[PDB]
Design an enzyme around this catalytic site. Sequence first.
Site, PDB file in Angstrom:
ATOM      1  N   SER A  48       0.811  -1.234   0.000  1.00 36.36           N
ATOM      2  CA  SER A  48       0.000   0.000   0.000  1.00 36.36           C
ATOM      3  C   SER A  48       0.836   1.272   0.000  1.00 36.36           C
ATOM      4  O   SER A  48       0.453   2.270  -0.606  1.00 36.36           O
ATOM      5  CB  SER A  48      -0.934   0.050   1.173  1.00 36.36           C
ATOM      6  OG  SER A  48      -1.900  -0.986   1.112  1.00 36.36           O
ATOM      7  N   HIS A  51       1.677   1.758  -3.579  1.00 41.56           N
ATOM      8  CA  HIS A  51       0.508   2.241  -4.309  1.00 41.56           C
ATOM      9  C   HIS A  51       0.463   3.763  -4.289  1.00 41.56           C
ATOM     10  O   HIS A  51      -0.008   4.366  -5.235  1.00 41.56           O
ATOM     11  CB  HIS A  51      -0.811   1.747  -3.729  1.00 41.56           C
ATOM     12  CG  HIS A  51      -1.091   0.280  -3.908  1.00 41.56           C
ATOM     13  ND1 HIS A  51      -0.549  -0.493  -4.905  1.00 41.56           N
ATOM     14  CD2 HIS A  51      -1.931  -0.532  -3.221  1.00 41.56           C
ATOM     15  CE1 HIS A  51      -1.013  -1.725  -4.817  1.00 41.56           C
ATOM     16  NE2 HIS A  51      -1.862  -1.777  -3.805  1.00 41.56           N
ATOM     17  N   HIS A  67       2.831   3.264   7.155  1.00 48.32           N
ATOM     18  CA  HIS A  67       1.709   3.002   8.042  1.00 48.32           C
ATOM     19  C   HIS A  67       1.821   1.758   8.898  1.00 48.32           C
ATOM     20  O   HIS A  67       0.885   1.484   9.658  1.00 48.32           O
ATOM     21  CB  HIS A  67       0.418   2.935   7.222  1.00 48.32           C
ATOM     22  CG  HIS A  67       0.386   1.808   6.249  1.00 48.32           C
ATOM     23  ND1 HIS A  67       1.081   1.824   5.060  1.00 48.32           N
ATOM     24  CD2 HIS A  67      -0.202   0.594   6.331  1.00 48.32           C
ATOM     25  CE1 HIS A  67       0.865   0.684   4.419  1.00 48.32           C
ATOM     26  NE2 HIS A  67       0.105  -0.088   5.179  1.00 48.32           N
ATOM     27  N   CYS A 174      -0.132  -3.672  10.269  1.00 49.71           N
ATOM     28  CA  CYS A 174      -0.815  -3.792   8.995  1.00 49.71           C
ATOM     29  C   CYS A 174      -0.902  -5.201   8.487  1.00 49.71           C
ATOM     30  O   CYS A 174      -1.931  -5.809   8.609  1.00 49.71           O
ATOM     31  CB  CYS A 174      -0.286  -2.859   7.887  1.00 49.71           C
ATOM     32  SG  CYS A 174      -1.332  -3.047   6.424  1.00 49.71           S
TER      33      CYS A 174
HETATM   34  N1  LIG Z   1      -7.535  -4.290   3.122  1.00 46.78           N
HETATM   35  C1  LIG Z   1      -6.528  -3.849   3.890  1.00 46.78           C
HETATM   36  O1  LIG Z   1      -6.698  -3.406   5.005  1.00 46.78           O
HETATM   37  C2  LIG Z   1      -5.109  -3.940   3.328  1.00 46.78           C
HETATM   38  C3  LIG Z   1      -4.864  -4.138   2.031  1.00 46.78           C
HETATM   39  N2  LIG Z   1      -3.588  -4.216   1.501  1.00 46.78           N
HETATM   40  C4  LIG Z   1      -3.464  -4.578   0.118  1.00 46.78           C
HETATM   41  O2  LIG Z   1      -3.248  -5.994   0.027  1.00 46.78           O
HETATM   42  C5  LIG Z   1      -2.540  -6.237  -1.171  1.00 46.78           C
HETATM   43  C6  LIG Z   1      -1.360  -7.206  -0.916  1.00 46.78           C
HETATM   44  O3  LIG Z   1      -0.367  -6.541  -0.176  1.00 46.78           O
HETATM   45  P1  LIG Z   1       1.059  -7.234   0.009  1.00 46.78           P
HETATM   46  O4  LIG Z   1       0.897  -8.641   0.404  1.00 46.78           O
HETATM   47  O5  LIG Z   1       1.848  -6.265   0.806  1.00 46.78           O
HETATM   48  O6  LIG Z   1       1.504  -7.203  -1.527  1.00 46.78           O
HETATM   49  P2  LIG Z   1       2.650  -7.955  -2.338  1.00 46.78           P
HETATM   50  O7  LIG Z   1       2.939  -7.108  -3.510  1.00 46.78           O
HETATM   51  O8  LIG Z   1       3.748  -8.378  -1.392  1.00 46.78           O
HETATM   52  O9  LIG Z   1       1.966  -9.311  -2.799  1.00 46.78           O
HETATM   53  C7  LIG Z   1       1.122  -9.380  -3.933  1.00 46.78           C
HETATM   54  C8  LIG Z   1       1.326 -10.764  -4.538  1.00 46.78           C
HETATM   55  O10 LIG Z   1       0.453 -10.844  -5.634  1.00 46.78           O
HETATM   56  C9  LIG Z   1       1.056 -11.567  -6.700  1.00 46.78           C
HETATM   57  N3  LIG Z   1       0.370 -11.294  -7.969  1.00 46.78           N
HETATM   58  C10 LIG Z   1       0.470 -10.141  -8.727  1.00 46.78           C
HETATM   59  N4  LIG Z   1      -0.306 -10.257  -9.767  1.00 46.78           N
HETATM   60  C11 LIG Z   1      -0.950 -11.476  -9.686  1.00 46.78           C
HETATM   61  C12 LIG Z   1      -1.919 -12.191 -10.487  1.00 46.78           C
HETATM   62  N5  LIG Z   1      -2.452 -11.723 -11.604  1.00 46.78           N
HETATM   63  N6  LIG Z   1      -2.304 -13.373 -10.040  1.00 46.78           N
HETATM   64  C13 LIG Z   1      -1.804 -13.924  -8.903  1.00 46.78           C
HETATM   65  N7  LIG Z   1      -0.919 -13.315  -8.157  1.00 46.78           N
HETATM   66  C14 LIG Z   1      -0.497 -12.095  -8.546  1.00 46.78           C
HETATM   67  C15 LIG Z   1       2.472 -11.073  -6.645  1.00 46.78           C
HETATM   68  O11 LIG Z   1       3.354 -11.939  -7.334  1.00 46.78           O
HETATM   69  C16 LIG Z   1       2.717 -10.979  -5.165  1.00 46.78           C
HETATM   70  O12 LIG Z   1       3.349 -12.131  -4.615  1.00 46.78           O
HETATM   71  C17 LIG Z   1      -2.181  -4.903  -1.775  1.00 46.78           C
HETATM   72  O13 LIG Z   1      -3.107  -4.481  -2.760  1.00 46.78           O
HETATM   73  C18 LIG Z   1      -2.277  -3.974  -0.600  1.00 46.78           C
HETATM   74  O14 LIG Z   1      -2.460  -2.623  -0.958  1.00 46.78           O
HETATM   75  C19 LIG Z   1      -2.533  -4.366   2.427  1.00 46.78           C
HETATM   76  C20 LIG Z   1      -2.782  -4.395   3.723  1.00 46.78           C
HETATM   77  C21 LIG Z   1      -4.059  -3.854   4.258  1.00 46.78           C
HETATM   78 ZN   LIG Z   2      -0.478  -1.984   4.686  1.00 50.78          ZN
END
Ligand SMILES: NC(=O)C1=CN([C@@H]2O[C@H](COP(=O)(O)OP(=O)(O)OC[C@H]3O[C@@H](n4cnc5c(N)ncnc54)[C@H](O)[C@@H]3O)[C@@H](O)[C@H]2O)C=CC1
Ligand SMILES: [Zn+2]
Lengths: 374, 374
Positions: A48, A51, A67, A174
Amino acid sequence: STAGKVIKCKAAVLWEEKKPFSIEEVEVAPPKAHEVRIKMVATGICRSDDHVVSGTLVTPLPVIAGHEAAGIVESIGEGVTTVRPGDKVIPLFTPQCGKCRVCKHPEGNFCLKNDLSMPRGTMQDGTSRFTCRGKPIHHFLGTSTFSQYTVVDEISVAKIDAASPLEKVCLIGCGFSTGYGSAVKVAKVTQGSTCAVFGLGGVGLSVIMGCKAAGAARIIGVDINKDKFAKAKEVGATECVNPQDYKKPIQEVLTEMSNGGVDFSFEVIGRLDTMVTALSCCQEAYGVSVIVGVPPDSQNLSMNPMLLLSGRTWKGAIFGGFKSKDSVPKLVADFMAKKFALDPLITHVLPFEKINEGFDLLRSGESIRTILTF
Amino acid sequence: STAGKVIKCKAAVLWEEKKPFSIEEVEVAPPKAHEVRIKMVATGICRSDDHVVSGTLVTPLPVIAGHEAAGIVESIGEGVTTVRPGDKVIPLFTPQCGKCRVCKHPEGNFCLKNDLSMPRGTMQDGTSRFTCRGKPIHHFLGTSTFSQYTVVDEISVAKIDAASPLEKVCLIGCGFSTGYGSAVKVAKVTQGSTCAVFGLGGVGLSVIMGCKAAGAARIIGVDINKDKFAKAKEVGATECVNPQDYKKPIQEVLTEMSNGGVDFSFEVIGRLDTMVTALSCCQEAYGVSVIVGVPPDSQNLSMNPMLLLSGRTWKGAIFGGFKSKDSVPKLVADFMAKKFALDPLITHVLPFEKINEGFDLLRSGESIRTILTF
Ligand SMILES: NC(=O)C1=CN([C@@H]2O[C@H](COP(=O)(O)OP(=O)(O)OC[C@H]3O[C@@H](n4cnc5c(N)ncnc54)[C@H](O)[C@@H]3O)[C@@H](O)[C@H]2O)C=CC1
Ligand SMILES: [Zn+2]
Ligand SMILES: NC(=O)C1=CN([C@@H]2O[C@H](COP(=O)(O)OP(=O)(O)OC[C@H]3O[C@@H](n4cnc5c(N)ncnc54)[C@H](O)[C@@H]3O)[C@@H](O)[C@H]2O)C=CC1
Ligand SMILES: [Zn+2]
Ligand SMILES: [Zn+2]
Ligand SMILES: [Zn+2]
């Protein structure tokens, strides 16, 4: 002594989108009434935060992002009752005011005082505590942790165990809590169930940890980067699949693997297409799909509502559904009692000065969480 | 008498979309193994039958439609154990085989033997029991109740109380149960809550009945036809609103009325735009929205997934979430004990021969339910 005085310190400022952070001196004002100034000890690099750089998440610039952190209270403003100087704390990107309709509801956590929905990039009073080169700098989600010192509203800070290891428990601010709660609280994964987790980064791994804790029988990890699979299996995935390996759409693959659809699916990436794929792979009559990932600003998805009419449930959540100020201290206490592990999420530890290198590790796919130390 | 023999009887045949039903002689084959032949006593006119005519709901033509009915068993095929000749029964448009993964799940009701997802317009064995003018005619949802006699699979029929008034309890076969269960079972409306119901036809009235039974404090009916409001208030609506009276979009109106969003919303129309409006009007952190209406075939909606990320839950259901064969007899028993009323839904009664008049009443907005008597 620093209390009551402006502090000059180092912070990573983002002056405009799609540029590196600039590490430079900032002035941090003393806390006003109901505010807390915190000396940072460790902060994680979360997608995030990236982003904000990429323009996926829109927030006023220039900004101090960050954060997911842990630190020590330096001073408190008038009227603060919940923390004192010297306390270990985790800033809360989702606040808990305790008074609004959401805070009073037994299952809400998206407090009406949040700065997520319509971001202003300020303290609750509408002003900023940061200056850099004579210019005001915005806050990010009421936290701004990419700084040696930050100021937060009291409703956006939680006091944690004085014996806590801050270089690990920052992840409770987070990524760990988000993923773990998304499984155990939001989806309410059941014993014996089949789960599919899309995205095997820090948050996705924490979803897997929660699915395993909830007693899932099968946890299918889905990622386009096969380098992520080994760690996913270590924390509980029973199988991993790469959509690029298949001629058919992955929802069809997953529906076949689960003999008619999964019980619970999780979108932990932030892509519109994977949100719809994830919903479609859960069982049509009783499946539940949870959106965790953050998609690009102002973009709509397209879906056939027959997917829901048959009986599926679709939901999303911020911060794993946890009421933040109540839950964070309990999660830290559970960590200290060995109820879950955080080390599997931490792949790199770098000094704060190497923040840009940390972001390059994330963007190249090599890291899960890099922790920055101050 | 007629057992084992072809019955010649009248049915309402739909030969082509957007045309009147043709009341004419059909041949009804005797029941094969695990089938039941039923003499119809009463059938309701539901908007889903009209959707067949308009092409909103696609099913093979020519067809005998009708799905909300009650009748008396004329004969049973080999191996039938759950009904006998002379029993009062309600045909079940959603079957309950009792054996599939959905039937075995505690929540699921969309049995895998259904003819709704991928309609074939046949019996379970892939054939038809109807002929007209020498040509095979399709079944509809395994029920086909617009006929003096029909044949249904045993998993698509429930035995009900021998003293039941069939001209009322036919509504338990679709519209009442759907709406009432969508409130009490799918949404799980809570005491003291605020509900919004979009669409004040028979199904939406039945949602209101369920919301009231569950103890909602406020029930806001929404319809573009203000002639629907009086009856909505009679069955429990506290307020009604016509979107056409407002300059602002109705989600904004409803959010303002409910001081930040409703607890439960229901889409009971069948429009893509109102599905999204209904989701939007529920409280962003803890609201639940249920899709009940049937949308136009194969059309996708467009929505912003940030609506879900904040905490909303979106779900749909068929037949109010009720396991059909278990639930229908219990609903009839509860009606006989005065636990709910059906008369408020019944606005018109006609003989079966006046079916086309009945559809005219629906289409003009004048009726809620018209019951046809054979
Ligand atoms: N709802 C909430 O409160 C929160 C949401 N977020 C969001 O969660 C998401 C994940 O965050 P992180 O784990 O830190 O991200 P990250 O970037 O470490 O992990 C994302 C994973 O998705 C994979 N990926 C990318 N495109 C793909 C596809 N088409 N198909 C399958 N896998 C694919 C990547 O290879 C990667 O391993 C982000 O969008 C972030 O902004 C993060 C924490 C809090
Ligand atoms: Zn986060
Ligand atoms: N999910 C399920 O198992 C079932 C679904 N259905 C579906 O439920 C829906 C309702 O069925 P009925 O009550 O029989 O239909 P109906 O046609 O009697 O009632 C629909 C109501 O919606 C109102 N309406 C139309 N456009 C509107 C708009 N833009 N805003 C507000 N109100 C609007 C109409 O004026 C009318 O009063 C149909 O789509 C039907 O196919 C029916 C029963 C079972
Ligand atoms: Zn609050
Ligand atoms: Zn079944
Ligand atoms: Zn119906």
